[PDB]
């Protein structure tokens, strides 16, 4: 998929 699970991180920026 285009999506990739962050494995527990609510956000990344």
């Amino acid at each position, epitope marked *: 998929r285009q999506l990739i*699970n*962050t494995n*527990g991180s609510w956000h990344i920026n």
Partner: antibody
Amino acid sequence: MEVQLVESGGGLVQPGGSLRLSCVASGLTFTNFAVSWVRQAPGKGLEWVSAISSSDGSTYYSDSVKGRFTISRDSSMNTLYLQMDSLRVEDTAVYFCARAVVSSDITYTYWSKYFDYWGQGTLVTVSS
Amino acid sequence: GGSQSVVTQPPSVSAAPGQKVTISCSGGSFNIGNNYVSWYQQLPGTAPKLLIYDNDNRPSGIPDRFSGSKSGTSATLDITGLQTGDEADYYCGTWDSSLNVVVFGGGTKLTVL
């Protein structure tokens, strides 16, 4: 084994006062998931409030609770909390603990954040 | 009293047992337009439960008469073979890249009659 996300600490309080909610997971893991608190005011819809990352412990808040609420976890690894200070009547609501599945594309622009399990919730009433 | 929502849903939907029902969510570019939608069932006095995730996926214990789709800044939840046990409040949910919160639709009360 029963599967449970139990919240507690809800109660009646005067505006300006404070309360601490806790959410305890049983029969489910927090490993590889984030966790959020979502509330529902009297007769209204669901409103996201705050979240914590199980990975690095990063914390996040809606603008309406910033500076007043504090989300945290302890070494049990299956428990989180929501300290609520300087409460306001509009903070009145049932507070749900909900496990979040988080994903994004490689450029961190497109996001998928959904809640795959929720607790029955705890009621918080702020009024004089 | 009355108000406006970031993501809008009809206040109520109704149909007789066996019929089809559709609930839509209308948002903007920063929420439904660019992010993934999920749907929830909140039974009276009950913990909300996930029905659909990432626009059209169904979690393991959810019957296929529940389905979701996304188009533009809009999303839809389809429920066929309506049953009395389906009475509940339904919410779509999505990240909003502008407000930086997971926004939930206003909610739709499903009555089966």
